[PDB]
Design a protein around this motif. Sequence first.
Motif, short mmCIF file in Angstrom:
data_model
loop_
_atom_site.label_atom_id
_atom_site.label_comp_id
_atom_site.label_asym_id
_atom_site.label_seq_id
_atom_site.Cartn_x
_atom_site.Cartn_y
_atom_site.Cartn_z
N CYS A 2 2.02 35.56 -4.98
CA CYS A 2 1.75 34.73 -3.85
C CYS A 2 0.35 34.33 -3.53
N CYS A 8 2.78 31.39 3.04
CA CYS A 8 3.19 32.70 2.56
C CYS A 8 4.38 33.46 3.24
N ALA A 9 5.58 33.47 2.44
CA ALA A 9 6.55 34.19 3.11
C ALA A 9 6.64 35.72 3.44
N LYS A 10 7.26 36.29 4.17
CA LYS A 10 7.26 37.53 4.68
C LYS A 10 8.34 38.44 3.71
N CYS A 12 10.42 40.49 1.06
CA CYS A 12 10.54 40.55 -0.33
C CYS A 12 10.55 38.86 -0.66
N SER A 15 4.83 38.56 0.48
CA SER A 15 4.15 39.59 0.88
C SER A 15 4.54 41.02 0.64
N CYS A 16 5.90 41.30 1.06
CA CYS A 16 6.14 42.87 0.69
C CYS A 16 6.70 42.75 -0.73
#
Length: 19
Positions: A2, A8-10, A12, A15-16
């Motif tokens: 990403c 930016c998503a969090k 899975c 981010s994770c």
Amino acid sequence: ACGXGXGCAKXCAASCAAS
């Protein structure tokens, strides 16, 4: 990959790293 930022998503999504 990403790249963080805002957009930016969090979790899975970008981010994770859902193992």
